[PDB]
Amino acid sequence: QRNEEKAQREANKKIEKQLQKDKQVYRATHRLLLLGAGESGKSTIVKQMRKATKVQDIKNNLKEAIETIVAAMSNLVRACYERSNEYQLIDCAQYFGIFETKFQVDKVNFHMFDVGGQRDERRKWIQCFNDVTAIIFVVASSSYNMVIRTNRLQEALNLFKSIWNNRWLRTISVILFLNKQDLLAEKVLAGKSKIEDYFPEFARYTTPEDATPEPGEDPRVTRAKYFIRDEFLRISTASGDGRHYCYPHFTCAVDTENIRRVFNDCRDIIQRMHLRQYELL
Amino acid sequence: RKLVEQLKMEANIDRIKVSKAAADLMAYCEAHAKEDPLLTPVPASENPFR
Amino acid sequence: LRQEAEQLKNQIRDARKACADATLSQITNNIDPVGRIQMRTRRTLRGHLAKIYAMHWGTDSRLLVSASQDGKLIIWDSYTTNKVHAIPLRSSWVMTCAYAPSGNYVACGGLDNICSIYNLKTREGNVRVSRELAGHTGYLSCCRFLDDNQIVTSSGDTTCALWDIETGQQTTTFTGHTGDVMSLSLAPDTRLFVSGACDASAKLWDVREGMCRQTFTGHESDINAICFFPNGNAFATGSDDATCRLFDLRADQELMTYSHDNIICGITSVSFSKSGRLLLAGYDDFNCNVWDALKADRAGVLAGHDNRVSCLGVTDDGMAVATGSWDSFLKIWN
Amino acid sequence: VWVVGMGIVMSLIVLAIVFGNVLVITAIAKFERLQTVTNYFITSLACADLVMGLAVVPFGAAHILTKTWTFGNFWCEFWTSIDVLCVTASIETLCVIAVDRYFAITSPFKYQSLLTKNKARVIILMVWIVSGLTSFLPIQMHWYRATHQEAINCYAEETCCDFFTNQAYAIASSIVSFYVPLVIMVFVYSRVFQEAKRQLQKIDKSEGRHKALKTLGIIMGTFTLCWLPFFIVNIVHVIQDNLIRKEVYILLNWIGYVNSGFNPLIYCRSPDFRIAFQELL
Ligand SMILES: CN[C@@H]1CCc2c(ccc(O)c2O)[C@H]1O
The residue among C255, C252, C172 whose CA lies nearest residue C204 is C252
In ligand 1, the atom with minimum distance to the C-alpha of D176 is: 11
Residue A244 CA neighbour count, 13 Å, CB half: 22
In single-letter form, the type of residue at position A258 comes to N
Q: Let me know if C320 is exposed, middle or buried by CB neighbors in 10 A (0-12, 13-18, 19+).
A: buried
Give the residue ranges of the annotated binding site of A: 36-44, 114-118, 179-182, 253
Cβ <8 Å between A271 and D105: yes
Q: Is C292 left (phi over 0), alpha (psi -120 to 50) or beta?
A: beta
In ligand 1, the atom with minimum distance to the C-alpha of D174 is: 11
| DSSP-H helix ranges across D107-148 | 111-114, 117-133, 136-140
- Residue B26 is part of a domain; what is its CATH number? 4.10.260.10
Q: Which domain holds residue B41?
A: 1-49
Contacts of D105 (CB under 8 A, 6+ apart): A271, A274, A275, A278, A280, D192, D195, D196
Interface of B with C in 11-50 (CB under 8 A): 11, 13, 15-26, 28-30, 32-33, 35-39, 41-42, 47-50
Q: Which domain holds residue D45?
A: 2-280
| Resolution in Å, one decimal place | 3.5
**Contact yes or no, C with B (3+ CB pairs under 8 Å):** yes
Domain boundaries, chain C: 2-333
- Residue D164 is part of a domain; what is its CATH number? 1.20.1070.10
- Best to test chain C binding among B9, B20, B36, B40 (most C CBs inside 10 Å): B36
Contacts of A120 (CB under 8 A, 6+ apart): C156
Tell the CATH superfamily of the C2-333 domain.
YVTN repeat-like/Quinoprotein amine dehydrogenase (2.130.10.10)
Cβ <8 Å between D33 and C327: yes
Given a contact cutoff of 8 angstroms between Cβ atoms, the answer to whether C55 and C66 are in contact is yes
**Alpha-carbon distance C240 to D221, whole Å?**
49
Looking at the 3D structure of chain B, how many domains does it have?
Answer: 1
Looking at the 3D structure of chain D, how many domains does it have?
Answer: 1
**Three-class secondary structure assignment of chain C:** CHHHHHHHHHHHHHHHHHCCCCCHHHHHHHCCCCCCCCCCEEEEECCCCCCEEEEEECCCCCEEEEEECCCEEEEEECCCCEEEEEEECCCCCCCCEEECCCCCEEEECCCCCCEEEEECCCHHHCCEEEEEECCCCCCEEEEEECCCCEEEEEECCCEEEEEECCCCCEEEEEECCCCCEEEEEECCCCCEEEEEECCCCEEEEECCCCCEEEEECCCCCCEEEEEECCCCCEEEEEECCCCEEEEECCCCCEEEEECCCCCCCCEEEEEECCCCCEEEEEECCCCEEEEECCCCCEEEEECCCCCCCCEEEECCCCCCEEEECCCCCEEEEC
**Alpha-carbon distance A260 to A258, whole Å?**
5
Strand pairing report for A108-114 and A30-35: parallel
**Alpha-carbon distance D210 to A281, whole Å?**
8
Work out the minimum CA distance from D104 to partner chain A, whole angstroms: 7
* For helices D73-106 and D246-267, angle between their N-to-C axes, nearest 10 degrees: 40
- Residue A67 is part of a domain; what is its CATH number? 3.40.50.300
**Alpha-carbon distance C105 to C101, whole Å?**
8
Q: Which domain holds residue A137?
A: 1-281
CB of D174 closer than 6 angstroms to any ligand 1 atom: yes
